[PDB]
């Protein structure tokens, strides 16, 4: 499996409040977080706490990935809520998170998210959005109806997806998808080398205006 | 520093729902949990989740021990609440926990608890109860007003205590203190060898009736 990850502040925002992590050692899990300097702290806490929770508990709990991912996400949630106290006027910081946890065999991806960061799967020039955005509109802009850093955290969406060789998975913040249509994203995911695809996605988000922080993780199965 | 820990089912109860852990490698933290086979699972989850949270985050967070201990305890709380779902009719399991986290220097003890398990400090033949039991009566039997395994977890008491050479710390479940008065506990803590003191405390709890599971951790500073 090949994986590439890239974050970019984009062409308009002053700071990058997105964060990501790839388990480069074992390629088991992948995390993107879009914060809202409260946002930087929230996305960093989410990525670090989800990463550490998964590192610590993966051996013990990979047989129950939904419990593992819920507890990782709640560990992150609590950590953000504790920093909200004092802590100060970072009162309201929050972050999205999207996580892929691969099973040991590597052909099942547990997709977990809170917010409007996305997971997509690409296959043979067709792209599918896997996560459903936690926005009031997607519910049927708002924007967010759910984020990490709330005592009122009400939903952690988790679903498995089975994978085939040659599939790609994309974790992205909305800085990608507010600039690039899915049709455009799909073309860049067709680039064989995932490092080039990741860079091309970011570069295209910027070519198209880059109005937000943009983060991608591209995984080729 | 010398530490000894012992748990015993006692002379009446059928199973031991107490649990404990000593960081024998680095002597940084010590945990006793009294569960209420839901109780066994709750105390095991609390000890393991507090232990793992502290192992993972101690380097990063020992400079903010109250945040570290609150997040360790909430990690445990959440893990118990997730097993309550399904999980099944273990619906109501809960556990006390008492934790000592020593600072690096080893002469300050952060005492954290939920329930009616206790931390005591002994010095020069005098004993002091440090934690205040979360029972309705102590509030002014009930018994518990607080335990881990509640969505409604409302209190995690945490306080530091400074230590002198020759002090002893005792973590115990109420199986000790419902059989032995503090005057009696104090005498056994005067035993120089902490392994002998721990064994003597348990043995005395049983001599006096042993009506409950009894767990002690004895630390000589
Ligand atoms: Ca943002
Ligand atoms: Ca019990
Ligand atoms: Mg958005
Ligand atoms: Mg964004
Ligand atoms: Mg009691
Ligand atoms: Mg008891």
User: Cα distance from B85 to chain A (closest Cα, Å)?
Assistant: 10
8 Å CB contact between A129 and A182: yes
The experimental technique behind this entry is X-ray
8 Å CB contact between A213 and A19: no
| Run of H or E including A80 | helix A65-84
Residue B147 Cα distances to A7, B158, B162, B201, angstroms? 43, 15, 26, 25
- Taken in order B196, B197, B200, B206, the sign of the CA dihedral is negative
User: B59: helix, coil or strand?
Assistant: helix
Size of interface A-B (CB pairs under 8 A): 27
Q: Helix-strand-coil percent breakdown of chain B, rounded to 5?
A: 35, 30, 40
Task: Tell if the CB–CB gap between A78 and B56 is shorter than 8 Å.
Answer: no
Residues with CB under 5 A from ligand 4 (ion): A 34, 174-175, 212
List beta partners, residue B161. B109
Between the CA of B47 and the centroid of ligand 1 the distance, in Å, is: 37
Domains, chain B? 1-221 (3.60.40.10)
For chain A, list residues whose CB is within 8 angstroms of any CB belonging to chain B: 52-53, 55-57, 67, 70-71, 74-75, 78-79, 82
- Token pair in block for residue A8: 């970019």
Task: Tell if the CB–CB gap between A71 and B79 is shorter than 8 Å.
Answer: yes
User: Helix crossing, A65-84 with B65-84: angle to 10°?
Assistant: 140
Task: Tell if the CB–CB gap between A82 and B75 is shorter than 8 Å.
Answer: no
Does residue B87 have a cis peptide bond before it, meaning omega lies within 30 degrees of 0? yes
Residue numbers in A near B53 (CB within 8 A) = 56
Say which of A56, A70, A79 has its CB closest to residue B52: A56
User: Cα distance from A119 to chain B (closest Cα, Å)?
Assistant: 25
- Taken in order B71, B76, B79, B81, the sign of the CA dihedral is negative
> How far, in Å, CA of A82 to CA of A97, rounded?
18
To one decimal, the resolution in angstroms is: 1.3
Chain centre to alpha carbon of residue B90: 22
Other beta carbons within 10 angstroms of residue B88's beta carbon come to 8
Residue numbers in A near B52 (CB within 8 A) = 56-57
User: Cα distance from B71 to chain A (closest Cα, Å)?
Assistant: 7
Ranges of beta strands (E only) in chain B are 2-8, 18-22, 29-34, 97-102, 108-114, 118-123, 126-129, 157-162, 168-172, 214-220
Other beta carbons within 10 angstroms of residue A51's beta carbon come to 19
CA max distance for chain B: 50
Question: To which residue do tokens 């006692």 refer?
Answer: B10
Other beta carbons within 10 angstroms of residue B103's beta carbon come to 16
- Token pair in block for residue A11: 């062409």
- Token pair in block for residue B83: 């097993």
- Give the nearest chain A residue to B51 (CA atoms): A56
8 Å CB contact between B164 and B112: no
User: Cα distance from A176 to chain B (closest Cα, Å)?
Assistant: 33
Between the CA of B163 and the centroid of ligand 1 the distance, in Å, is: 46
Extract the annotated binding site of B.
34-35, 116, 164, 174, 178-179, 208, 212
């Amino acid at each position: 499996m090949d994986v590439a990850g890239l974050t970019d502040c984009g062409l308009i925002r002053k700071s990058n409040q997105d964060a990501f992590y790839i388990d480069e050692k074992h390629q088991r899990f992948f995390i993107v977080a879009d914060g809202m300097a409260g946002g930087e702290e929230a996305s960093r806490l989410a990525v670090d706490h989800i990463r550490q929770y998964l590192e610590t508990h993966l051996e013990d709990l990979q047989h129950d990935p939904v419990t593992l991912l819920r507890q990782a996400f709640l560990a992150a949630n609590h950590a953000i809520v504790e920093q909200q106290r004092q802590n100060s006027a970072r009162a309201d910081m929050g972050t999205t998170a999207v996580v892929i946890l691969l099973d040991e065999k590597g052909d099942r991806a547990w997709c977990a998210h809170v917010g409007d960061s996305r997971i997509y799967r690409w296959r043979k020039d067709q792209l599918q959005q896997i996560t459903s955005d936690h926005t009031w509109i997607a519910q049927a802009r708002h924007v967010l109806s759910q984020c990490l850093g709330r005592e009122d955290l009400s939903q952690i969406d988790i679903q498995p997806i089975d994978l085939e060789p040659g599939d790609r998975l994309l974790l992205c913040s909305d800085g990608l998808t507010e600039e690039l249509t899915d049709d455009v994203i799909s073309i860049y995911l067709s680039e064989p080398n995932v490092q080039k695809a990741a860079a091309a996605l970011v570069d295209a988000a910027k070519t198209h205006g880059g109005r937000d922080n943009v983060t991608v993780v591209v995984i080729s199965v």
